[PDB]
Amino acid sequence: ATCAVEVFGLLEDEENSRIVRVRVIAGIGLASDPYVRVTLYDPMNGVLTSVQTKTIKKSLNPKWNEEILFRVHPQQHRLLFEVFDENRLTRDDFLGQVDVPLYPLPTENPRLERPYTFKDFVLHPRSHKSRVKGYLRLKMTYLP
Ligand SMILES: [Ca+2]
Ligand SMILES: [Ca+2]
């Protein structure tokens, strides 16, 4: 409200911490009201936090175009993206996951405008039962 942009994850800056800007741009050819839960974790200690995007109603190609900032230990922490279909009266159906490291990533240049670029990541099953299709379009960069 007085905060336009929150930083999640580590609650203070240390020598070994950076802020990563995660753009959750779109889902492409998903298997329908999708959102993405973005979980920040450490292999040794498990989940630090998670943030959920808005839900896009009735779409197999949702354009969330949403940014989330996390304060992280870039060489230690990882991100798990899980896409779900929000169901009002039952369990939300799983539409796939992507799991990525947080180093190396480009650092933003404060003097220049952030260019639009992206990478597509194939969505993966979470069990033999998952029926998953398509890609998650993302961009991750460090703040100066
Ligand atoms: Ca639904
Ligand atoms: Ca539900």
Residue 135 C-alpha from the chain's centroid: 13
Q: Residue 61 in contact with residue 27, Cβ under 8 Å? A: yes
**Distance from Cα 11 to the centre of ligand 2, integer Å:** 30
Amino acid at 42: D
What is the DSSP code (8-state) at residue 133? -
105, 74 contact by CB (below 8 A): yes
Å resolution of this model?
A: 1.8
Residue 88 Cα to ligand 2 middle (Å): 5
Given a contact cutoff of 8 angstroms between Cβ atoms, the answer to whether 22 and 69 are in contact is yes
Q: Which ligand is nearest to the CA of 60?
A: 1
How many CB atoms are closer than 10 A to CB 9?
18
- Look up residue 139 and give its amino acid: K
Structure tokens at 62: 């949702």
Q: What domains appear along the chain, each with residue ranges and CATH number?
A: 1-144 (2.60.40.150)
Kindly report the length of the chain: 144
SS3 labels along 28-74? ECCCCCEEEEEEEEECCCEEEEEEECCCCCCCCCCCCCEEEEEEECC
CB-proximal residues (5 Å) to ion ligand 1: 33, 85, 87
Q: Which of 22, 27, 29 lies closest to 8, judged by CA?
A: 22
- Whole-number Å distance between alpha carbons of 12 and 14: 7
Cα(32) to centroid of ligand 2, in Å? 12
Radius of gyration of the chain (CA): 15
